[PDB]
Every structure is written in structure tokens, then in C-alpha cells.
Design a protein around this ligand. Sequence first.
Ligand SMILES: [Zn+2]
Length: 883
Amino acid sequence: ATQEEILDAALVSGDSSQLTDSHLVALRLQQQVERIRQTRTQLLDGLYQNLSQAYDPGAASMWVLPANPDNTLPFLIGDKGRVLASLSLEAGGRGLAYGTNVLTQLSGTNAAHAPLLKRAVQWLVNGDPGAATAKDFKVSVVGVDKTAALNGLKSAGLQPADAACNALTDASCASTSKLLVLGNGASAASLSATVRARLQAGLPILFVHTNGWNQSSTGQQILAGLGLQEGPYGGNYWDKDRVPSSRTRTRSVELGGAYGQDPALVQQIVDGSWRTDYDWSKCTSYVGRTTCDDVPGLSDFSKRVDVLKGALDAYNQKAQNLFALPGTTSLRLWLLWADAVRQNIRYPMDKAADTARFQETFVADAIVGYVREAGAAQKELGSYAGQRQQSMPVSGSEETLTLTLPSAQGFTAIGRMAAPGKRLSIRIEDAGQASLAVGLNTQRIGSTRLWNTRQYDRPRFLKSPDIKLQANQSVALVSPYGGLLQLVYSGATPGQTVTVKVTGAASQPFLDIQPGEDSSQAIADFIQALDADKADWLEIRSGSVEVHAKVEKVRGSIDKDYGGDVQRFIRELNEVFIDDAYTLAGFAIPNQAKTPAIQQECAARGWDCDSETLHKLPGTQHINVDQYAQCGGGCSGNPYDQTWGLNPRGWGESHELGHNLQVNRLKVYGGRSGEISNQIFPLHKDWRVLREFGQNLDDTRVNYRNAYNLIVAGRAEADPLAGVYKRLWEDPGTYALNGERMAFYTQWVHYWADLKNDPLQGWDIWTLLYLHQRQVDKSDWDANKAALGYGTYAQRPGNSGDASSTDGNDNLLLGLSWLTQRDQRPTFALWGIRTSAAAQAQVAAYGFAEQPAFFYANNRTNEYSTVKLLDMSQGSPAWPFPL
Ligand SMILES: [Zn+2]
């Protein structure tokens, strides 16, 4: 078969598998775009002639936009670019929609529009804007006032007669009526479908939005029947856009022909006239990531490409197959062109060395249609994947999976992959009240480093749009890239399940630790899948953490850090990394009782330390392990990105996990502890690792010595609390005084260890503070405040994260005083930490003996046997370790 014959077939089926000649497709697209422009401009020129185009719908109006570009078009575009009315040629019919009821303004504010409206109505009735209507032409008016509408039409020089019947819902009235006028009061079965069917059968429709700047679902449905869409929330309220009387024929004809179309970009594609002289010296670099926002001309190019992506991604998001909807040829050609381009992409490309390949690929990467029955794999997957991903076996039968949702909103790995160019079918069942979508992959967009020299080596958009699903309705997908399937959810009940059915999917290595079940078999099966080595990507689900990882990166870590010992790697991931953090935070972990000391303290305080209501595990934290990251070689977020691999014992792993587990009421001076109060997680892990294993990791993180220097100097000032504050907490820098501020947090660990007379118990104070804080945050205030040491508070305290707030300082003071049964105000003052009068009154009410100011000093972070206690109440001792 010729490429010509392949293209013709693929326009019907969507099957681009054998289509490689992108130039041929681009030539067809060129003629299609030109056909659309010729049709539009001829119609708009006939409508406008030299009549005034003045049209002012006021603030109390909505915008009304084309939705299908092939058969709809703007009619009135204001100076600010807002579409105020649109024309429809959908299904071979004739429709016109305004964003306000212009018919009742033809004697007033829009008297000047009457001549033009007359031509538009001539075009509706006759199909020719210069053909006069017959006297007494029958007009049916539905959902807006009949008399006022007919009087409006008369005001424009027309002589309508009342059809006296409902042409929206009565097929016989539709057949004799010359025009149907609609507003938002209409009633009908299947309103969009009914409107479409009337239009297709030849009833001309004039729609007027009757709800001002308010949106209308009836209007949205009518407009969808015309192939139009309502503009966004607020309507014309802020912009107050209008067409001025100075608007020329030529200008509006040009704007209307160009709207939502890019003939210049099509021509650049066809001719290969990609820009050879972008000024790349204007790019800049931030932590190794190059961006180019200030390269002249580049942002405008990128925004034009975004229009195309936006257009196709609306179909993706709605789970609509473009090839199943009539009147979508332009978009079909764009998509088939991009699929053809994907057959020829080769990596890597550089922005200066390979301008034509780089720029054409830049466009093609933005145009991916996932909802289809067939289509092509991209031939080269570069730094993303390789031959394994391309050759993964797929299941011919339906697979059934049950997923648990740990919070109301987020996404979770389904445990299967789309294979490149291979159809899969998916559906969800048993979803309760959750709203669901399916997605592919988890990459963040900064992880395609296309502006770095020679690093355009994968697709721009490896993560698909979220593809909405309805319960019990199957959707067919084809990805050019393959990818890890994700269930995206919102409005869920924590702990609920969902059933996923999928046919045609591949099975990546997938480790699904069962919350409180034996896992030695799951581990063995995962290892066996890794040993078979048929995949480029894997996933791991363990508690509230999910890892999405390039296989080669995980192998690298197992080899480097574990000498090839996969078993120990996995067990440490689960226990030393994940379980360590969530246990430190005191969450209710299924089938894992609290330690005896935590149990006993909680019991002695009469606390709820075990309910799911207060202490359920939080929403999933995702981790991406890949060749590239969103920012730097590793980036905060959810997911957070790592490019080195995945080390269960690593500082960064736990530092980032810790950000997910931070709470404002345990931060000193809000944001000043933004990179402090999360460090308990990696510090605890390192203390544990030294004791159990003997590796001594990050042993100089906590800078007790320099904290001491700053405290000793600041407390010599006239206001000693302010003096310390200035030297320790004032600096707003992201990582300012990181080591010194950490030494505050560990004071309480050493203190608690001494209080309990047990070195192993020291970190329990943080677990207790977390348990206490979640009760403060969520328990019934009146019933629980006495038990939480907050009896003097009429209302729950605030949760501000601002550095100027005392909400964290206060809760730390109260929690620590309450748990230790000593008034801790002198040590809080020593550290420069101010508290509110309310919190001070509350500590006074406890009736506890003061703990005089103290300081725990050490010359190592991880080894606590050497820590020394300094009494600070009478003066400042010497630093007690030799320099
Ligand atoms: Zn951080």
C-alpha cells in the first residue's frame, strides 16, 4: 500500500501503524486548513459587507466560542479577543449563538447592530445573507419571551410571524418553522442531541444566552448541540469586551478565518523552514536546568504549540475518540501527522545543532491522541525506555485488580502498563462515590531537559492527560510511548476500594506490599519479574509510599549500595526507610502495635493514640526515580524526583519524605523550620543505622557547637530572647542556619532519654508530640482539650505556618511542657523562641516545677553516648569538647 492509501484509511480508523510520510500528511493538512479559511471568509464577508460591526453585550453576558473548528467559527470578536457570538455549520445546518439576549437591545444599546443582525437572520433562514426573508416567515421561540423576541426581530427590519408551536420538541413544527429562537428556559429530552438533530434536518437556530454573566447548563447543552461552548466563569464581567464601530470588514474577516487555526505553523512544517537563528545566549541555567523563556520569539512559538495540545487534550480528558466524531478532519490530520513524525524521531537532539529536527519534534510531542482503537508506537524512546518496553507481552484476556484508596484525593498505581502502540481497554467498577480517571506515567515536565545542550532525548509529555472514566464504561487507549497506568481519584472515602478491569495490558515488575500480611511471596515474585528483565520501568507500593522507577536506576542502587542483594534492599526500603518514618510520626500502621513505652505513656495520659479517625496513614507520597528530575538532580513535591537511584539509607530519601510529614504546629517560627522540622526523619534513621548496622552516615549534620556559639552571644544582649532570635532564627534563607536550628529539635531527644533513664527511648518524644498534635488538630475540642493540656483555651489554636505567628512555637511549648511535666519556658527563651501570652498562661496553669535552662552538647550527630548536659541557668559554660 502507498503512504497515500495508508493515510486515507488511517483518517477513518486512526490506525497510523504504517504511516511514515509526515510531509504527505502536512500537505493534506495545509489544504484542509485552507479549505476551512476559504469557507469562513466567504461566509463572514457576505455577512458583514460594509455594515457597522458595533456590538456591545455589556458586563452581563457570556462568551460563546467555537468548539469544533472545522464547522464552527466566530461571528463577533471583541477588541480584547473575546468571542461574543459564534456561527455554526455543524451537521450541514445553520446556527448562530449570542452571549446575551441581543434581540431585546435592538432599540437601545445595540440599535447599531440591527442591520447586521438582519443579514445574519437572512443567512439563517435562506442560507444567503443577502436573500430577503418572506413576509410572515414562521418563527418558533422556546425558552425566552416570545413577544419580546419577535419584536426584536421586527426592530431589525424583519417581518416574522409566531409559529405558535415548539420547534425544539415538535418534529412537525420543526418541519414548517423557518427559524427557532432558543434561550435558557427551554425544556427538552436529550437537549444537545435534540438540537443537533434539528440543525442536521435543516431547522436554522438562533440561540441567545439569557442569564447574563452567569453560566447556564441548559445553554451549555444547547451550545454543544451547535458545536459551540460557553466561555469560562464570570462571562464578560471583568473584560467588558465589545466590537467598536471602527471595526473594519477586512479585520473581522481575517480574525474569523484565522481563529483557532495556524496556517503559518502548517506552512513551516511543510517547507521545513524552522528557525535557524534563535538567540540561545538568552537561556539561563538554574541548578543545572536550562530554560529559555527570554529567548525572543520562543515563548510565542511555544504558546502556539500549546493551543494545539490544548485542543487535542480536551478530547483525551473527556475520553473521546477523535476518529469516532464527524467533522474533525483538521484535528485528525494534526494527530496523524504527529504519529508519522514519531516514526522518524531520533535522539538526542540539540537546540542549536539540530534546529529542524528539534523544532518539528517539539510540535509533534505536543500532539498525542490516546483514546483510540489503533495507532503507532514511537520508534525510539531514547532516555525514557528501550527495546524491552517496545516488546513487553500483553494480556489477551481481561485482568481484574482491586485497589485501595488511602485518602480522598490523589492517584495510585494500577500495577499494569500500556505497551507502545498496543490497544488496551480499561474500565472501573465498584467505585462508590469516587470520581475516577486513568493516567499514564508520572514524569514532571521539567524532566525532559530539551533546552540543555544535547539533552532533547525523550518526549516532552511522557505523562498523559487524566482521561475521565464513568463507572462501568470501557475506554480504549493506545499510547505511542507505553506507560505505567495510574488510577486518578477524588471525592473518595479513605480506605475504600475500586475494581479495575483491563485487557491488553503488560505487567511491569510490581511489588505490592500488603499492609500487615506476610510478603515473602510477593517479594519472591517481584524478584522473579526483575530477573526476567522484560521491562524498563517498575513500581513498588509499600504503605503510603509508591515508587515509580527506571529499572536500570534501581539495579544500579542495589549493585552499588547492596552488592547485588535485592532481598536486603527491599527489606530495608520497607523497614529502615518507610516504616521508620511513619512509625516515628505515630501513625496507625495496620497490624503493628505501638512500642511498650509509647503504649504506656499514651495510657497514662488517657489519650487516643490508635484510632484511624485521628491517626490514619496519610495520602500517598510518590517517588519518581529516573534519569532526569523536574529541577536539579532531585526535586521536592509529590512525586519527588531522584536521579541517583533509590537508597533506603539515604539522607535525601528521608529528608523529602519528611516534608510530606511536617505539620505547622511543630515548626519553630513557621517557615524558618521549613527545612528543619522534616529533618527528624533522616536524623532518626541515621541514629538507628549507626546502632543496628554500624554505618555512620551524615554524622556532622547537627551543629550543636555553632548553635551554642550563637546562643551564648545572643543571650548576652539586653533582651536575651531577641538577641538569640536575631542570631539563629531571623535569617529567612531557605537553608539558613540549617545545622544550628536542627540542634533545637534534638535537645528534646536527649532530654527525654534522660527523663526516661533509657537511651533507646529518646526519639519517642517526637512520636508523642505527633500523637498529641493530631489530637489538637482534629479531636472534638471541648471534650478533649483538658487531656491535651489546653483547658484554658476556649477554641482550638491556630495552625499558621507563617514565621510571624506563634502557633508552632506555642504548641511546641505546651506539648513539651505537658509531656515532660516541667515548665520549659526557660529553655524556649534560651533558644530565642517567643510564645503568646495565652500559651504562657496555659503553661503557668499546669503548676509544674520550672526546668531551668539547659543545653545538650555533642561533637557527633549520631552517637549519643558522648552527649554532655550543660546547666545554662546561671551563666554559659565553656563548650565541653576539645577543638
Ligand atoms: Zn527540603
